[PDB]
Symmetry: D2
Subunit: 119 residues, 4 copies
């Protein structure tokens, strides 16, 4: 089961600067305003739904992503996230890619930000 994105607000849209899109940190918010339900892979799918939306608004896609940074509270959780990341960046793989332990907002287990070319 895939899912629909949260509506994009002013602050969740990211910013476009000299032809590059810099998404904000996209968390696994549903269109309710609630952390989606599941283990960490389900949250990751949601983060991706949210990525796809703000990419699309800004005139970008996963194919023009040139960097993606994964935030998580525990580096143990990386492998499950990367399991999921591989379905979206598959035959395209962003040239640079960081994972980085961080305080997430309440009930979030994963946040992703991406830099992307706006053709």
């Amino acid at each position: 089961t895939k899912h629909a994105p949260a509506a994009i607000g002013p602050y969740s849209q990211g910013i476009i600067v000299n032809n590059m899109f810099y998404s904000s940190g996209q968390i696994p918010l549903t269109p309710s305003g609630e952390m989606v339900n599941g283990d960490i892979k389900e949250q990751t799918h949601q983060v991706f739904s949210n990525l796809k939306a703000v990419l699309e608004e800004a005139g970008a896609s996963f194919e023009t992503v040139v960097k993606a940074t994964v935030f998580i509270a525990d580096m143990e959780q990386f492998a499950e996230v990367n399991e999921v990341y591989g379905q979206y960046f598959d035959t395209h793989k962003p040239a640079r890619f960081c994972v980085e332990v961080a305080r997430l907002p309440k009930d979030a287990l994963v946040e992703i930000e991406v830099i992307a070319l706006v053709k």
Copy 2:
């Protein structure tokens, strides 16, 4: 919480120009940056870190032109000590924020 401790490092989340009561410092980018540094003081001390133990700092701002002003303040809390690394990034800040700073620090 204002961050996470892992493996003797502290990783602050971004501090914005709020007073302790939570009302935004309505004032120019230098006034705001002082308040951000005052929030950094507290989260650092709360974690058993200090300014001296900051090894990275990352500045988020709307316009790269506002760096000179932020730096003139950065350099008053970090003068005898200068973190070894520092990034500066253009970003959309929360409402009325002109500056936001994150820090990585050693917890001794």
Copy 3:
């Protein structure tokens, strides 16, 4: 080689402060900075990029105290355009170098 290009992005090698004649440059940290900018300018036009399409710069610097000065020079070359991201970092340079500079750039 000095560079690689992926997904339309030029990812430059660290440009140290050498003259075209092969020799470290004759002076203080500004002159070095200038030379690194003259050097970078050529590696960029070669790639289908320019200063105007730079999006990140990493300043490797020997002594973080001298950034005020590297930055006076960064301002000259990125005057109208300022890249949206940059980092400064302390590092071990080739003997005699006080500064080295990498950029990420767009190749339209």
Copy 4:
């Protein structure tokens, strides 16, 4: 080629997969990545730091396709501790270098 120590932190230069003998090692990327780690072992232990004290690693690879391999290797030494951050980046390497790691580590 040494690396740096500041505010109790080791900042390694980038370890390519060379033997004790100056010789580029005989292998796939998996065998290479084991040599890089051999050489990280050394410079880490000379600096006053172990693999357990690494707070960040960065991997340079010439093809992002080979990351799932390097990451398996990575897994063996960064097992019961994982560095709190890591990056991976496509850059150019020098000779028959598929892989290249620098790292940042605590010291006392």
